[PDB]
Structure formats: C-alpha cells, structure tokens
Amino acid sequence: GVTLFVALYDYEARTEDDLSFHKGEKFQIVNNTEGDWWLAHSLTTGETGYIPSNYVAPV
Amino acid sequence: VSLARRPLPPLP
C-alpha cells in the first residue's frame, strides 16, 4: 500500500499552485522528492497542488 | 526557484 499524510494546521494558500487546507484533512503524495513543498492530492477537497511539508505528518 | 523549493511558511 501507501502512506497518507494529515494536515497538522490550517493553511491559506497565496497562489492557486498551492492548496489551502484545514487541520485534519488527508493527502496522497504525488511528488516529495523535488523540495520541501510536496505536490499532493487532497482526499478531503479533491484538489491537487503543492503543500508545505512542515504542515503535515504521516498517518 | 521552482515551486517545490520555495521557502516554507513558518509554523502558525
């Protein structure tokens, strides 16, 4: 299987390249090797975009 | 920088 990630804190994106999200939302990771912003898909909202890796933790 | 390599936000 896979490892999902959960938001630890709310985050308001400044660009549509990034996701806005709320604490407790869950993500699948699309790409985590290019830098500390990870391309992710929100299972909670259905959106795909970058998330800051310091705002999430593995479930 | 690329989107992936931008500075991270501070913790809230």
Structural domain of residue A41, as residue ranges?
1-59
A1 vs A20: CA distance, rounded Å: 26
Which helix or strand (DSSP H or E) is residue A42 part of?
strand A37-42
In what helix (H) or strand (E) does residue A31 lie, and over which residues does it extend?
A: strand A26-31
Give the best residue of A32, A37, A51, A56 to mutate against chain B (max B CB count within 10 A): A37
Return the residue matching tokens 């604490």. Answer: A23
Asked if B2 and A34 touch (Cβ cutoff 8 Å), the reply is yes
Q: How many domains does chain A have?
A: 1
Q: Do A38 and B4 touch (CB under 8 A)?
A: yes
A33 burial level (CB within 10 Å; 0-12, 13-18, 19+) = exposed
CA–CA dist A8, A6 (Å, integer): 6
Pick from A40, A37, A39: which is nearest to A54 by CA? A37
Q: Does A40 touch chain B (CB under 8 A)?
A: no
Q: By CA distance, what is B3's nearest residue in A?
A: A37
